[PDB]
Design a protein around this ligand. Structure first.
Ligand SMILES: NC(=O)c1ccc[n+]([C@@H]2O[C@H](COP(=O)([O-])OP(=O)(O)OC[C@H]3O[C@@H](n4cnc5c(N)ncnc54)[C@H](OP(=O)(O)O)[C@@H]3O)[C@@H](O)[C@H]2O)c1
Ligand SMILES: NC(=O)c1ccc[n+]([C@@H]2O[C@H](COP(=O)([O-])OP(=O)(O)OC[C@H]3O[C@@H](n4cnc5c(N)ncnc54)[C@H](OP(=O)(O)O)[C@@H]3O)[C@@H](O)[C@H]2O)c1
Ligand SMILES: NC(=O)c1ccc[n+]([C@@H]2O[C@H](COP(=O)([O-])OP(=O)(O)OC[C@H]3O[C@@H](n4cnc5c(N)ncnc54)[C@H](OP(=O)(O)O)[C@@H]3O)[C@@H](O)[C@H]2O)c1
Ligand SMILES: NC(=O)c1ccc[n+]([C@@H]2O[C@H](COP(=O)([O-])OP(=O)(O)OC[C@H]3O[C@@H](n4cnc5c(N)ncnc54)[C@H](OP(=O)(O)O)[C@@H]3O)[C@@H](O)[C@H]2O)c1
Ligand SMILES: C[C@H]1O[C@H](OP(=O)(O)OP(=O)(O)OC[C@H]2O[C@@H](n3cnc4c(=O)[nH]c(N)nc43)[C@H](O)[C@@H]2O)[C@@H](O)[C@@H](O)C1=O
Ligand SMILES: C[C@H]1O[C@H](OP(=O)(O)OP(=O)(O)OC[C@H]2O[C@@H](n3cnc4c(=O)[nH]c(N)nc43)[C@H](O)[C@@H]2O)[C@@H](O)[C@@H](O)C1=O
Ligand SMILES: C[C@H]1O[C@H](OP(=O)(O)OP(=O)(O)OC[C@H]2O[C@@H](n3cnc4c(=O)[nH]c(N)nc43)[C@H](O)[C@@H]2O)[C@@H](O)[C@@H](O)C1=O
Ligand SMILES: C[C@H]1O[C@H](OP(=O)(O)OP(=O)(O)OC[C@H]2O[C@@H](n3cnc4c(=O)[nH]c(N)nc43)[C@H](O)[C@@H]2O)[C@@H](O)[C@@H](O)C1=O
Lengths: 342, 337, 341, 341
């Protein structure tokens, strides 16, 4: 009997994980937020092995009711206010969902009598390293969060550890570095770039603005990373793992590579908030900088060391950066060609 | 200077209100929830409009938005608005619909705007619940029948308290059911219009409803948002019922909707075994499922909007037959594309 | 098997109810808030009583306590109960008094007790606020006048909804003001009785009040907790007004309290400049301070408890004159033994 | 102009800090929780001090208080501070100790005081939990072991974030265990000193503890509140460990406490069957009960306060033997005057 409950099933990762588990013959249950509009765009194609339940990580009673009904063998807590910039002005909501919500879900497991039968995956994050204390970052690198998002996720990381140690819950922290896809939220930098570049190629847009072009990230593909989540729950012992590519690129490079895929070479001029990216062939300005996209406390650099996962889970990243960029730009050209308002 | 802040701007009413205020030359600000996906479908055609991330459960974010915007008018339309869902999401519904109203009022006061802003609260005919008078007017005693109704009752009274304690210009719009082609799919009218449209297009054969005998006073959201604005143009802050005064059953909505795709529904059976059958073909198109019932139903609503007619010169423009036609025609076109 | 769970057990009413139920042979469990100091002063003489740490804002703790206790009766007396304080602690008051009632009801349902437990909600005459009928009875429309009243109104209706939706035996006790020697010092009656006692003993000369013209229906808490239990012994779950039906002003409470220490108060002046003077000595003993006023006052309350008299055979035993005497005498004895009490 | 706002003013540390700041001529404001009973026992002797009703879970009340007070210094001492209680009140503990710190910081920012106020956060050696280095210093990685520790870890980092993001002068005092005659009765040191005092006076025969082998670095709260003030006098906002660097077991606290009433405890048995017996009389005075154990214990703490010594000229003044003597003697005097104290 394999029965998964996914919080955050409507999100990027939840949508890939649902598909991954359905292919393995799991009964998949998801918690979906009530919305005034359709919010199941990423999973509607899966529509009798998936069932959706209304809930919220801020409502403990609803979590108990869902877990009691489902009796899952595996729980993946992917539900979160996941946007770092937004977390600065929605700090309390972010704490309540991403931090305290993790506690609520763990307490619901315990309340439902499932402490010995469920395996629990927590969606931890490279944001925990923030102002990185070692390069590269591994499981033993000390945490230094740099946003209300990071602080909330740090609470969640440690409350998970506490349920594991106090009550022998099989609970694990996936410390996942940035992962992207054609399903990535439009407000994250990679998808913002790929969508904008696609529109420029099609003549639907001339210019877009970014924040910090010099931020450096370790970017992988979400489809590869959800497999690691499942692998962590197949492990004999509950252990925490870094999941990452170990390769670093700047936002500036993401922009350059994205424009190359529509046949344009970006050339940079100016400094700081007056820097612009110009088409080499035509001289048209396609990229500007706006301070409103900066974070008050930036995370300048991330590079993950996934040695432990490679050795213990036989996990490896399959999609590299150049292919990730190509896939996202090509997907968004096709999306925007079919529908200019997409 | 006319600057409106709308909570619940992405919802049915918020989307119509935003258009209404933009046409009048308002600077319109909306509070939008962070979402993992696009959630601005009803208003994207408008983007004098600025959107701000926020949530009615986060007090600090509300203070920050109000301080930046300095609105002259606030419309609190943000809510977990589904009555059935409120029975299993009772605490979330309380925190958003009840305590969230307090948070927004306290944010106004914190920002020093108690004497300058006009505040509209989205109250509701659900406050009457098990109706104590027929028809219902402003002085009809409330009797809520769900966690939604209870939360909205808290909100109604905390608004009254800010008005009486601090002389805030704050009003309760006691709006009866209002619908549109933008209505959420999970409400009965849109569920019917979408399902009937799908049946016409061969995309569906049958759908299930709950209580076919529930009776409602149904108007058009576009008309009702105008009443909200009119309440804030009034010289004194007063509470108003907004309604058509005409009552129809869920069963009638179903019958009229099927007539618009050229089918006559004939009913047979009783209770949870009742079915609706096409007269011409004999195919079963409507069934009943107890899972769509509410544990405590609101059997009957009929609003008396005499006070609004006299003081605001408001009148509904869209009648029931036109509402049904518009919704069914819009969903046939939507589902075909 | 008679097992009661009392939220708000450390408060005035909880302390009397615990004693009342213990005398009947109940196993009594209470939920107590964590405090940096001793907070069990009203009940320490009782410790068949067990206390559990919890809070009406923490859903999981309520489920854990109910699962452990398996109560047959639940009395939800826990609340931020002070009306003036509710104006500056409006959200906390909503979360405890309103949403906390929902949390406790949801915990009952979660624990599988919807068909076995009887649930008492501590409703209040504050629901009537700007009174729509005189006297007020169960069918008088509510008109709350504070964040406290609004929160309690939510609680009243969510209790009704659990009763109607799920057949929970749940009732609203609509209790009018009730006092005792255990009343919180920040409520007007105890503030007066303590202050008058101190004046009699020479520990104080003068004290200030707010609105002297407010009128209340005042009974004794010990009588009223019996009505709570009687409501849960009823065959059907019904809501009841519990009250004396007799009205007095704050001014009268002051006058009667001073008479019990041998002084006649004579009033001069108006509004915030009104003062109460000893007739014999001319000393000023009572002044008025606007800081004790509420932004939206509840001017007048008078309860009609006909339904309780007919269905429960309940009647108030302590009348106003005896209530005042008891409170003043108790505080004279308290303050004589300990000037810092 | 020196105006301090203290959250948690009614607690052990708040009470000593208020006295310390008043002696320096500060205007002192405290946030006090509404309570059904008197809860200002530690500070009533001081009532320039002004108290305000509030709660760390109610953002609006914090903004109102800060706007009125316009403090130059804020000390966030308010918390559900009991580690054992945190396991069953995990969500409440998170909301108060974690999110409440955010609420107070956001209130500062909302009130326009981000550049003028100095903010002290009550961090804790519980952050080290399963200690990653011995001794623990500012750079020792954190490993919390309770819902209390996790909540405080959130608070530590949100304070750091306000400092780094908005240039708030905000600091984390990483204080190791500190005790006093005003320590809450539910903490191990005061539980022992009160119980030993009662045994000496014939009011008690025996008491039970949990883990006798836990090791702590114990100082005196009166010394430690001075460190809090010193951290806000520093030119740059820095985090500091404040500790004695000396370690003792719970067992040693018990032994030394009994020596002060003229008894030598001798231990026999193991685990939950271990007992402490008077050598002279053979009477059992100490037993062990598993209900006082924590699911995830913090076995050992020893702080290195080198940084504070060098930068603040702070040093602990009261050592362990004097701490124990003071607590036992204070509780003998307290219990002699009043057996119900
Ligand atoms: N993608 C990365 O690079 C990465 C790396 C490490 C960790 N993470 C973390 O990994 C998880 C998944 O990432 P993602 O990219 O898939 O995030 P995402 O696209 O933002 O998805 C977030 C999901 O959580 C849901 N959610 C938000 N608030 C909720 C609440 N209050 N109650 C219940 N559900 C709620 C969202 O629902 P709606 O659709 O209704 O908004 C959505 O389904 C998140 O926890 C994120 O913080 C992400
Ligand atoms: N339509 C009626 O017949 C009727 C009659 C009387 C009163 N009402 C009340 O009138 C108002 C508008 O109705 P409607 O039909 O437009 O409702 P709706 O379509 O369900 O819209 C609800 C709106 O509130 C937002 N919202 C929900 N939770 C929120 C939160 N926690 N913080 C901030 N915003 C939040 C929603 O955002 P998402 O889009 O992100 O979900 C959406 O914008 C509601 O208050 C409803 O209860 C409706
Ligand atoms: N007395 C009246 O005249 C009257 C009339 C009608 C209704 N009421 C209502 O009747 C009930 C009892 O009145 P009372 O005079 O006994 O009130 P009270 O003396 O103020 O007692 C309030 C009790 O509730 C507890 N409490 C407060 N906040 C709580 C929280 N967040 N979680 C759990 N417990 C909490 C208090 O604990 P602490 O001791 O820790 O503060 C105390 O035990 C209250 O609900 C009140 O609103 C009173
Ligand atoms: N003493 C130590 O060894 C030590 C070491 C490091 C850190 N700490 C931390 O240092 C601080 C002070 O310790 P302590 O020994 O003085 O603690 P304490 O005696 O338990 O004092 C706790 C204080 O916080 C208040 N409080 C609790 N919940 C609150 C809420 N929701 N809103 C506002 N105030 C609230 C309490 O009020 P009531 O009186 O109403 O309960 C009391 O004034 C705490 O943050 C503690 O966690 C202590
Ligand atoms: C693993 C981790 O991954 C994600 O967190 P993130 O790294 O903040 O992701 P992002 O795409 O928002 O920013 C990446 C970098 O790009 C910079 N950047 C420049 N210009 C813009 C810009 O215009 N928008 C955005 N969004 N970022 C920009 C920005 O300042 C930052 O340095 C989440 O999934 C999170 O949930 C998570 O856990
Ligand atoms: C004014 C008020 O208006 C709305 O509240 P509502 O009246 O509950 O709206 P509804 O469309 O969900 O139900 C109308 C009636 O139809 C019955 N009904 C039967 N069968 C199904 C059925 O299958 N689905 C639904 N949803 N209802 C059904 C159902 O039992 C009820 O009797 C909200 O906007 C609310 O926010 C608001 O304030
Ligand atoms: C039944 C009901 O009973 C209580 O609510 P309350 O009626 O507000 O009780 P109180 O003693 O605070 O006020 C009675 C009247 O006296 C006036 N008054 C004058 N001068 C002062 C004065 O100085 N202090 C106070 N506190 N009141 C004063 C004050 O303005 C009001 O009109 C709570 O147990 C509540 O939980 C509850 O449910
Ligand atoms: C610095 C830090 O300091 C305090 O946290 P704590 O160290 O947990 O304090 P405590 O006195 O509760 O426990 C000390 C040790 O004693 C053991 N122990 C044995 N038997 C009993 C017993 O019967 N009761 C208690 N309470 N502990 C017992 C117990 O298991 C633990 O190992 C708080 O001020 C906290 O807020 C804070 O931040």
């Amino acid at each position: 009997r394999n029965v998964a409950l996914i919080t955050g099933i409507t999100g990027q990762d939840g949508s890939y994980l649902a598909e991954f588990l359905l292919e393995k013959g799991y009964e998949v249950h998801g918690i979906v937020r009530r919305s005034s509009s359709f919010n199941t765009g990423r999973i509607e194609h899966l529509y009798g092995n998936m069932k959706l339940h209304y809930g919220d990580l801020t409502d403990s009673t609803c979590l108990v009711k869902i877990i009691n009904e489902v009796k899952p063998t595996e729980i993946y807590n992917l539900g979160a206010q996941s946007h770092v910039k937004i977390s600065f002005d929605l700090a309390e909501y972010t704490a309540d969902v991403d931090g305290v919500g993790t506690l609520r879900l763990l307490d619901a497991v315990k309340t439902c009598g499932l402490i010995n039968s469920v395996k629990f995956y927590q969606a931890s994050t490279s944001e925990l390293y923030g102002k990185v204390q070692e390069i590269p970052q591994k499981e033993t690198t000390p945490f230094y969060p740099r946003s209300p998002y990071g602080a909330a996720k740090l609470y969640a990381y440690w409350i998970v550890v506490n349920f594991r140690e106090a009550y022998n819950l099989f609970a694990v922290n996936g410390i996942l570095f940035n992962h992207e896809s054609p399903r990535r939220g439009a407000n994250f930098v990679t998808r913002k770039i790929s969508r904008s570049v696609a529109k420029i190629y099609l003549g639907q847009l001339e210019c877009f603005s970014l924040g910090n072009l010099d931020a450096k990230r370790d970017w992988g593909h979400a489809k590869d990373y959800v497999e690691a989540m499942w692998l962590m729950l197949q492990n004999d012992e509950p252990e925490d793992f870094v999941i990452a590519t170990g390769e670093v690129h700047s936002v500036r490079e993401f922009v350059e590579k994205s424009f190359l895929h529509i046949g344009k070479t970006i050339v940079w001029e100016g400094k700081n908030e007056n820097e612009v990216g110009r088409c080499k062939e035509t001289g048209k300005v396609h990229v500007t900088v706006d301070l409103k996209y900066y974070r008050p406390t930036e995370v300048d650099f991330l590079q993950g060391d996934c040695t432990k996962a490679k050795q213990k889970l036989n996990w490896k990243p399959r999609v590299a950066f150049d292919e990730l960029v190509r896939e996202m730009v090509h997907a968004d050209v096709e999306l925007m060609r079919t529908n200019p308002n997409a």
